[PDB]
Amino acid sequence: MVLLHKSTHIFPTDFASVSRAFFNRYPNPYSPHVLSIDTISRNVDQEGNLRTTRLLKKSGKLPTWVKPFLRGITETWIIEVSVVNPANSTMKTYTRNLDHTGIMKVEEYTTYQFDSATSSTIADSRVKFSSGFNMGIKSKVEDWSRTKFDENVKKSRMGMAFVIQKLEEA
């Protein structure tokens, strides 16, 4: 079983503000379940780009019906990979859960892109929910996925909004 969702947001801000905010996303009031975040590797590659790999721990609560079948999981590790191209004002981000992969795998691609004409930063997101080990009828899995996608669209966009405002407020 596979589900894909696409969203798009326009930050009316410059690439520097938006990217610096991405790296400084946490903590923020829209992401209380995020317990930690650590930078695993970071370096400049041969084309001038900044490659970052970060590691997040996030708490969660499964929906109740699933609970007997599972398997007592609260927390999840998430890997975050990113490339910053300063000559194009382009940032590419990819996240995914590191664990509970066999149950449910949730990948996200977000592209931040500065559009000089509109003086704004376009962020396009694609989120991929993959699940073999179906366990339960998909519709609840599909609904669970719709609910989580919609919740993280608002959470990430409000969280980024917030962080950008407060970083400029200095």
Binding site: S19, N43, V44
Partner: protein, 71 residues
């Protein structure tokens, strides 16, 4: 902002601070590519990897680190 291993948190902050200044003033202005934050990074990353060795998540991470999703 906390590290998964609390005893690393303070080494993280000082790394982050430094990088925050390097990123905004040097990197995006196209001035610098140099890792001006050498020792903050080294201290931090040392602490964090020592913390990681005791962690079950670490082989998943080591395998994940060798994927290049923007392929």
């Amino acid at each position: 902002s906390a590290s998964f291993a609390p005893e690393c948190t303070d080494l993280k902050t000082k790394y982050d601070s430094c990088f925050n200044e390097w990123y905004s003033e040097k990197f995006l202005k196209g001035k610098s590519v140099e890792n001006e934050c050498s020792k903050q990074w080294y201290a931090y990353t040392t602490c964090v990897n020592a913390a990681l060795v005791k962690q079950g998540i670490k082989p998943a991470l080591d395998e994940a680190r060798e994927e290049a999703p923007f392929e």
